[PDB]
Design an enzyme around this catalytic site. Structure first.
Site, PDB file in Angstrom:
ATOM      1  N   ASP D  90     155.494  88.396  -2.916  1.00  0.00           N
ATOM      2  CA  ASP D  90     155.482  87.196  -3.755  1.00  0.00           C
ATOM      3  C   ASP D  90     154.178  86.429  -3.536  1.00  0.00           C
ATOM      4  OD1 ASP D  90     156.148  84.883  -5.251  1.00  0.00           O
ATOM      5  OD2 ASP D  90     157.091  83.967  -3.489  1.00  0.00           O
ATOM      6  N   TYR D  91     153.518  86.015  -4.621  1.00  0.00           N
ATOM      7  CA  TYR D  91     152.206  85.356  -4.524  1.00  0.00           C
ATOM      8  C   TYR D  91     152.215  84.080  -3.674  1.00  0.00           C
ATOM      9  CZ  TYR D  91     152.296  81.120  -7.475  1.00  0.00           C
ATOM     10  OH  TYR D  91     152.525  79.859  -7.970  1.00  0.00           O
ATOM     11  N   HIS D  92     153.392  83.485  -3.488  1.00  0.00           N
ATOM     12  CA  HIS D  92     153.532  82.315  -2.615  1.00  0.00           C
ATOM     13  C   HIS D  92     153.915  82.722  -1.194  1.00  0.00           C
ATOM     14  CE1 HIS D  92     152.698  78.620  -4.721  1.00  0.00           C
ATOM     15  NE2 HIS D  92     153.516  78.896  -5.720  1.00  0.00           N
TER      16      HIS D  92
END
Ligand SMILES: [Mg+2]
Ligand SMILES: [Mg+2]
Ligand SMILES: [Mg+2]
Ligand SMILES: [Mg+2]
Ligand SMILES: [Mg+2]
Ligand SMILES: [Mg+2]
Ligand SMILES: [Mg+2]
Ligand SMILES: [Mg+2]
Ligand SMILES: [Mg+2]
Ligand SMILES: [Mg+2]
Ligand SMILES: [Mg+2]
Ligand SMILES: [Mg+2]
Ligand SMILES: [Mg+2]
Ligand SMILES: [Mg+2]
Ligand SMILES: [Mg+2]
Ligand SMILES: [Mg+2]
Ligand SMILES: [Mg+2]
Ligand SMILES: [Mg+2]
Ligand SMILES: [Mg+2]
Ligand SMILES: [Mg+2]
Ligand SMILES: [Zn+2]
Lengths: 206, 60, 24, 92, 127, 118, 98, 84, 155
Positions: D90-92
Site C-alpha cells: 500500500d502506497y501509505h
RNA sequence: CCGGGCACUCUAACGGGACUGCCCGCGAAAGCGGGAGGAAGGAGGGGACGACGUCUGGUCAGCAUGGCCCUUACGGCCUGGGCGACACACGUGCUACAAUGCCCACUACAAAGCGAUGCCACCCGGCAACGGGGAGCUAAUCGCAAAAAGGUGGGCCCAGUUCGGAUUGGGGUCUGCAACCCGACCCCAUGAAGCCGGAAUCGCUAGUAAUCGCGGAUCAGCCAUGCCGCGGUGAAUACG
C-alpha cells in the site's frame, strides 16, 4: 479515541451496578458466567418489550433478576403465560431456582439504551440518519432531561465513506464526576454494515 | 478463536498439561484472567458496564 | 555481584536458596 | 526472471498458484503483471501504459513500482534482467 | 507524672513518653544509642529537647514501629516535640519556629504505568 | 610450594593459592585445607614442610587435576563430537551448545563481530 | 460467644448490615463487642486499554473486599431470635462460628 | 549436566518393538516419531530411523551413544552456512 | 526554569558542626543516597585533619573551599558565526557549587586507597594552595582573562 | 506469654480543617508581595479524568460486521518439526569493569500483596536444589518472609584480583506423558569479555533522580534481566 464509559466512570457514585452480589475465589467466575447466560437470553427474547437493564441480586440458590422494560406487557404475556415460559426457560439454564420480577420504564424517553435502540432500529429501516438523530435528541430533550446527545457511527446512508453524526442539547458534562448521565449503545446490522449508536442523557446532578 | 479450536472445553487432555484457560466470552486465549474466566479486554468492557460485581475503577 | 549464582547476592537476586544462601 | 519475494501472498501465487494471499478479483491482474516482470529482460519492457511504472524516491531509492489496481502497488528492484524483493504494498 | 506525643514521618509512628528524670531513652527496649547503633543522624531525634534545655531534666520511653530507622528518627523527633508541649504548652513559642511541630508530609510517590519509576521515563533511540 | 602438575602457588593465602590450580576452586580450597587441617590464612611461604606434604598428597590424590583433567574434558567433547550428537555438532560449528540464542549475543562463543554489507 | 464475620463489597451494605445485628441482639444477650472493622483486601487488575499493541495504555481496576466482626458473648435464645431471621442486604454474605 | 531423575524414560512404541526383534536377533530398520525417548542398551546394534519433522533419518545406534536421546542424532534445522 | 527563579533548597546544618556548608559537601560526597557512609567519610577525614594537622578541621575545610572558588569563568556564546567564550564573574552561589564539586572530584582523583583519606589530604592541600582542586580553579580563571578580548559581549 | 485494660499504634467508617478566612503593603478590580496562627496553603503532594477535531493513524488476529474467496477442501484431527534458526545491523534492557568496593559472620528497621491440594511452620535425610514427615491457616490471629541497602567484627590490599560472571565439562533436583531440538534450580570444575566506553544520544526539578530489596497478575513448570505495584536510604541543579 479517548473518553471512558460514562457509567463505569461513575460507578462509585451516580450509578449502581447491574449485578450486586458478594462471592469469591472458587465461585465468582462461575457465579458470573451465569449472569451473562441470563442476560444473554433476555436480550435475545425481550427485544420487542424494550430491554433497558437486567439487575441481578443474589444470596444463595435463590437468584433475583429484575428485567426493566418499556412494555411490561409483552414481557409478562397473556394473563401471565409468557412470564411462565421464560421464568421456566430460566431454570433450564440455572438449576439455581430463581425469581423474575418486572419493573416498568417511566418514559422510555429517558433511557439511553432505549433512545439508542430506538435510533438503531430506524437506521436499520433506512430512515434519514441525521433526522432520526435530531428527532431523538428532541424527544429526550422534550420530555424532561437537563441535557441529551446522540451519536451515530459511520456509513451514514450506506455511503462508501464512513462518517459520524452528532446532535446535542443542554448540559451533558462527561467530565463532571457526579452528573448522572445515562449511557446507551445500540448496534445496527445492515446490508452495507454495522453502525453503532450512542445515546447520552443528563438528569439532575448532585 | 475458531469454534474448531475451542476443543479446550473437551477436558480429554490425554495429559492435563494440554489444558488452557481461554476466554469464557470471546475465546481470547491470549490474555485470560483466572478470577473471571475473562480476557483482559472483556474484563475491561464489563467493568465499564457494571456487570462485574464490586469491580470499581482503581486509583491512588 | 548480583550475577554470581554462587554467592549471597547471586542467590538473593535469583530469589533462591542453596549452599550459598541457606534457609537458616 | 523473478528471483526473490518479500510478500508471502505474491510468492505463493507465482510459485504454487496459491491465490489465497491476494484479493480474489485481482488474481488475473497480479498474475499478468508478475509474468511480465518475470519475462522482462530490462526495466524498459515493464513500461506498458496500464502499469504506471516509476522508480521510488527517498529511502526506497533503487526500487520500482507498477500499478495493480487502485492504491495498490507491486514494488521491486530490477537489476540485470531480474527483479528482486517482490512486494504487494500500500502506497501509505 | 508522664507526657505523650505521637509523631509520624515518611510512614513511621513513634510513641513518645517523657517523664521527669535523668535524661535517658529506651527506644523499643534498647538504649537510644543501642537501637540507632551507628547512625550519624540519630542525634536529631532529641533536638527538640536541647531546644528548650531539656534532656538532662526529662527521660523518654519510646515505642517505634514502621518504616526505617531514618524515618523513625524523625517520627521520634516529632514525638519528643509534641509531648514536650502537653507538658509545658508554652514551649511552642520556641519549639515551633524551628518547625519541629510539623509533620513532614513527603511520602513515596506512586509508581505510574508507562514509566519505570513514577517519573523515570523509558528511553528511546533514533526517535 | 609446588603441588600438582607443575603447580606453584605462592606468597598468598593457601586457599587463594590452591585456586591457582586447574581443578581447584574456592570450594575445594577450604576443603583440602579443612581435611588436611591447615590454617587457610597462612601465607603459602609461611607454610610447613609437613603441611605441604599432607596438602601435596591429599590434593594430588583425591581429585583429578591439571593436564590429566584437560585431557578428560577434551576427551569428552571429542566424543559427543564423533557421534552425530547435535551437542557435538554445536562444538564443530563453534556455536553455543547449551541452547541459547544465536541471532544476537553469542560473541563469547563466536569471537569478534564479522560485519558484512546489509 | 457467637463470633460473626461479615464480608461485603459495599462499605455501606455492611455498616448497615452488621449494624442491624448490633442493635438487635443488644436486647437479648451480652452487649456486643461493637462492629470491629478489620483490614480490607484489594485485588488489582491492570489491563492494557486497547487490543493490539499500545503497551502503555493500561487503566486500573480493583475489587476491594471489606470485613466486619461484632462478636456476641452470652448467647441467649432471644438473641438468636432478633437475629435468626431478620436480615436485609443482598450484597452481603455471612459466616458465623459460635 | 542433563537430568531426568529416577526412571529413564523411553516410549514403548519402539521399545517393546525393538526387543521383540531381539528375540529373532535384530532386523532391518525401524522408524519412530519418538525422538523423545532415551536410548537403552537393547537398542545398540540396531538402526532406528528418527523423524526430522519432515524425514526419517537412519541412525545406527552404537554403545558410545547410549545414554543420549535419538533426536540428538536427527538434526532439525539445516543451516548449511550463511551466504555468500 | 521559565517561570519562577527557582529558589535554593536550604539544607539542615551539620550534626556535629551545625554548619550547612558541611552538609552540602557531604551531599557531594554521597552517592546512591548512602548518606551515612558519606557523613562518615567526611568526619573520619576531619579526624585525619586533626592528627596530621594541629589545626581544627572545620577551619581547614572552609579555608579550602575558599581557595577553590573561581571568581571568573568562561561561558560559551554564539556571536556572529563562531562561538566566542565570554569571560565573566561567578555568582556567590555558583562559586560554592563548583568549589565543593571540584574538591570531591579531585579528592576522588587522588591515589590513597582510602576514601576518607583522599578527602582529608585533598582538603589540606587545597588549604595550602596546592592540589588538583585548586588546579581546576586556577585553570578556569586562566581560561577567562585569556579570552578577555571577547569580554565586551558582557552577557 | 497470663489475667486484665482500650488509653496508644493501628484497622475502617464518619466527622472536622484551607477559604487569601484574619493582619500589614500596592492595586480600580482580579490579584501580587509579606506576616500570624496551623499538620498543612494560596491549585498542600500523587491519581482517575483528555474538548471540536488531526494522522485515509492501529487492530477485520479478541470480539462484532458489509463485500470477495475456499468448501474432500483455504475446513478438521493427529504425531513430529517450526515460531528458539545465523555472516551480520538496530532498539529496550540485565550484569559489570571494583576499595564510597567484593566476601563471610553476627545483628536491626518496611510496605503492599498472595495462600485448597494452596501457602508451607517445625523435625529429619541431603553441601544443596530438594525429598520424607507433619502443626496451624479457610488466613489483621497460621504460612509465603529472608527485606536488601544498613550497623558491628573479620578477611581481600589494587591484582584482571576473594573484581566480573560469560562460556564449557560433569553430577544432580523439580514440574510435566514427555524437558534432543527447547525448561528452571542446585553442587563441583571451568572462569571469557570487561580497567568506565567514538561520532552521536536518553531520563529526571524532591521524597524526584540515583540506589536497595519486597509482592502480584499470567502460571504445571519457565526462559521475568519484562510488565504492573510496594516501601527503605535519599541528592545535585535551574542565571536564564
Ligand atoms: Mg471466529
Ligand atoms: Mg499450560
Ligand atoms: Mg565474586
Ligand atoms: Mg511518473
Ligand atoms: Mg522507590
Ligand atoms: Mg504519553
Ligand atoms: Mg515498555
Ligand atoms: Mg496518556
Ligand atoms: Mg501396540
Ligand atoms: Mg483581598
Ligand atoms: Mg477536571
Ligand atoms: Mg491506513
Ligand atoms: Mg518470537
Ligand atoms: Mg531495530
Ligand atoms: Mg544498571
Ligand atoms: Mg541438613
Ligand atoms: Mg570488616
Ligand atoms: Mg562512569
Ligand atoms: Mg509462575
Ligand atoms: Mg521481582
Ligand atoms: Zn474476551
Amino acid at each position: 479515541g479517548n473518553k471512558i464509559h460514562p457509567i463505569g466512570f461513575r460507578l462509585g457514585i451516580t450509578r449502581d451496578w447491574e449485578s450486586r452480589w458478594y462471592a469469591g475465589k472458587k465461585q465468582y467466575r462461575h457465579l458470573l458466567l451465569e449472569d451473562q447466560r441470563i442476560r444473554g437470553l433476555l436480550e435475545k427474547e425481550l427485544y420487542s418489550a424494550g430491554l433497558a437493564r437486567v439487575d441481578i441480586e443474589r444470596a444463595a440458590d435463590n437468584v433475583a433478576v429484575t428485567v426493566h422494560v418499556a412494555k411490561p406487557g409483552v414481557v409478562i404475556g397473556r394473563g401471565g403465560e409468557r412470564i411462565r415460559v421464560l421464568r421456566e426457560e430460566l431454570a433450564k439454564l440455572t438449576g439455581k431456582n430463581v425469581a423474575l420480577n418486572v419493573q416498568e420504564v417511566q418514559n422510555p424517553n429517558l433511557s439511553a439504551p432505549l433512545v439508542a435502540q430506538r435510533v438503531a432500529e430506524q437506521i436499520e429501516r433506512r430512515f434519514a440518519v441525521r433526522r432520526a438523530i435530531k428527532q431523538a435528541v428532541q424527544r429526550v430533550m422534550e420530555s424532561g432531561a437537563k441535557g441529551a446527545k446522540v451519536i451515530v457511527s459511520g456509513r451514514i446512508g450506506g455511503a462508501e465513506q464512513a462518517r459520524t453524526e452528532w446532535a446535542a442539547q443542554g448540559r451533558v458534562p462527561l467530565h463532571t464526576l457526579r452528573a448522572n448521565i445515562d449511557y446507551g449503545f445500540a448496534l445496527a446490522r445492515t446490508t452495507y454494515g454495522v453502525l453503532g449508536v450512542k445515546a447520552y442523557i443528563f438528569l439532575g446532578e448532585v | 478463536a475458531r469454534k474448531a479450536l475451542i476443543e479446550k472445553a473437551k477436558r480429554t487432555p490425554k495429559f492435563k498439561v494440554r489444558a488452557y484457560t481461554r476466554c469464557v466470552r470471546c475465546g481470547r486465549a491470549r490474555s485470560v484472567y483466572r478470577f473471571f474466566g475473562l480476557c483482559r479486554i472483556c474484563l475491561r468492557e464489563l467493568a465499564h458496564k457494571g456487570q462485574l460485581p464490586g469491580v470499581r475503577k482503581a486509583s491512588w | 555481584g548480583k550475577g554470581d549464582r554462587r554467592t549471597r547476592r547471586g542467590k538473593i537476586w535469583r530469589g533462591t536458596y542453596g549452599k550459598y544462601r541457606p534457609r537458616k | 526472471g523473478i528471483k526473490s519475494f518479500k510478500h508471502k501472498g505474491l510468492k505463493l501465487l507465482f510459485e504454487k498458484g496459491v491465490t489465497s494471499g491476494v484479493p480474489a478479483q485481482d488474481v488475473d491482474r497480479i498474475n499478468d503483471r508478475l509474468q511480465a516482470i518475470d519475462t522482462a529482460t530490462e526495466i524498459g519492457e515493464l513500461n506498458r501504459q496500464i502499469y504506471k511504472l516509476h522508480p521510488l524516491k527517498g529511502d526506497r531509492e533503487g526500487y520500482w513500482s507498477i500499478t495493480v489496481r487502485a492504491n495498490w502497488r507491486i514494488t521491486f528492484q530490477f537489476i540485470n534482467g531480474d527483479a528482486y524483493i517482490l512486494n504487494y504494498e500500500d502506497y501509505h | 507524672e508522664q507526657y505523650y506525643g505521637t509523631g509520624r514521618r515518611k510512614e513511621a509512628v513513634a510513641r513518645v513518653f517523657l517523664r521527669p528524670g535523668n535524661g535517658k531513652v529506651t527506644v523499643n527496649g534498647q538504649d537510644f544509642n543501642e537501637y540507632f547503633q551507628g547512625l550519624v543522624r540519630a542525634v536529631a531525634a532529641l533536638e527538640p529537647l536541647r531546644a528548650v534545655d531539656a534532656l538532662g531534666h526529662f527521660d523518654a520511653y519510646i515505642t517505634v514501629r514502621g518504616g526505617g530507622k531514618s524515618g523513625q528518627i524523625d517520627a521520634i523527633k516529632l514525638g519528643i516535640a509534641r509531648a514536650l508541649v502537653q507538658y509545658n504548652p508554652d514551649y511552642r513559642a520556641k519549639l515551633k519556629p524551628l518547625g519541629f511541630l510539623t509533620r513532614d508530609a513527603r511520602v513515596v510517590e506512586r509508581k505510574k504505568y508507562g514509566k519505570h519509576k513514577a517519573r523515570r521515563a523509558p528511553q528511546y533511540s533514533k526517535r | 610450594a609446588r603441588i600438582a602438575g607443575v603447580e606453584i602457588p605462592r606468597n598468598k593465602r593457601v586457599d587463594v593459592a590452591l585456586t591457582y590450580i586447574y581443578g581447584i576452586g574456592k570450594a575445594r580450597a577450604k576443603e583440602a585445607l579443612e581435611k588436611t587441617g591447615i590454617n587457610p590464612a597462612t601465607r603459602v611461604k609461611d607454610l610447613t614442610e609437613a603441611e605441604v606434604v599432607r596438602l601435596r598428597e591429599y590434593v594430588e590424590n583425591t581429585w583429578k587435576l591439571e593436564g590429566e583433567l584437560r585431557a578428560e574434558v577434551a576427551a569428552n567433547i571429542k566424543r559427543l563430537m564423533d557421534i552425530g550428537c547435535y551437542r557435538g555438532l554445536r562444538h564443530r560449528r563453534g556455536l553455543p551448545v547449551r541452547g541459547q540464542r544465536t541471532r544476537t549475543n553469542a560473541r563469547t562463543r563466536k569471537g569478534p563481530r564479522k560485519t558484512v554489507a546489509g | 460467644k457467637i463470633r460473626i464475620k461479615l464480608r461485603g463489597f459495599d462499605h455501606k451494605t455492611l455498616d448497615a448490615s452488621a449494624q442491624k445485628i448490633v442493635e438487635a441482639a443488644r436486647r437479648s444477650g451480652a452487649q456486643v463487642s461493637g462492629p470491629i472493622p478489620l483490614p480490607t483486601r484489594v485485588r488489582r487488575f491492570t489491563v492494557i486499554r486497547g487490543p493490539f499493541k499500545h503497551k502503555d495504555s493500561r487503566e486500573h481496576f480493583e475489587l476491594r473486599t471489606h470485613n466486619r466482626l461484632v462478636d456476641i458473648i452470652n448467647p441467649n435464645r432471644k438473641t438468636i431470635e432478633q437475629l435468626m431471621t431478620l436480615d436485609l442486604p443482598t450484597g452481603v454474605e455471612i459466616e458465623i462460628k459460635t | 549436566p542433563r537430568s531426568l531423575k529416577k526412571g529413564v524414560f523411553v516410549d514403548d512404541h519402539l521399545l517393546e518393538k525393538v526387543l521383540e526383534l531381539n528375540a529373532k536377533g535384530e532386523k532391518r530398520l525401524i522408524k519412530t516419531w519418538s525422538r523423545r525417548s532415551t536410548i537403552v542398551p537393547e537398542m545398540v546394534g540396531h538402526t532406528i530411523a528418527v523423524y526430522n519433522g519432515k524425514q526419517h533419518v537412519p541412525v545406527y545406534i552404537t554403545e558410545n551413544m547410549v545414554g543420549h536421546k535419538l533426536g540428538e542424532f536427527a538434526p532439525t534445522r539445516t543451516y548449511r552456512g550463511h551466504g555468500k | 526554569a521559565r517561570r519562577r527563579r527557582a529558589e535554593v533548597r536550604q539544607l539542615q546544618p551539620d550534626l556535629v558542626y551545625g554548619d550547612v556548608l558541611v552538609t552540602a559537601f557531604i551531599n557531594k560526597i554521597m552517592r546512591d543516597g548512602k548518606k551515612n557512609l558519606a557523613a562518615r567519610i567526611f568526619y573520619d577525614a576531619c579526624k585525619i585533619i586533626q592528627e596530621k594537622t594541629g589545626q581544627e578541621p572545620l577551619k581547614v575545610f572552609k579555608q579550602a573551599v575558599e581557595n577553590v572558588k573561581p571568581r571568573m569563568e568562561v561561558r560559551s556564546r554564539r556571536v556572529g558565526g563562531a562561538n566566542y567564550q565570554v569571560p565573566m564573574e561567578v555568582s556567590p552561589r555558583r562559586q560554592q557549587s563548583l568549589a565543593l564539586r571540584w574538591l570531591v572530584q579531585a579528592a576522588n582523583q587522588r591515589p590513597e586507597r582510602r576514601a576518607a583519606v583522599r578527602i582529608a589530604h585533598e582538603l589540606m592541600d587545597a588549604a595550602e594552595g596546592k592540589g588538583g582542586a585548586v588546579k581546576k580553579k586556577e585553570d578556569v580563571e586562566r581560561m577567562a582573562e585569556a579570552n578577555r578580548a571577547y569580554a565586551h559581549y558582557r552577557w
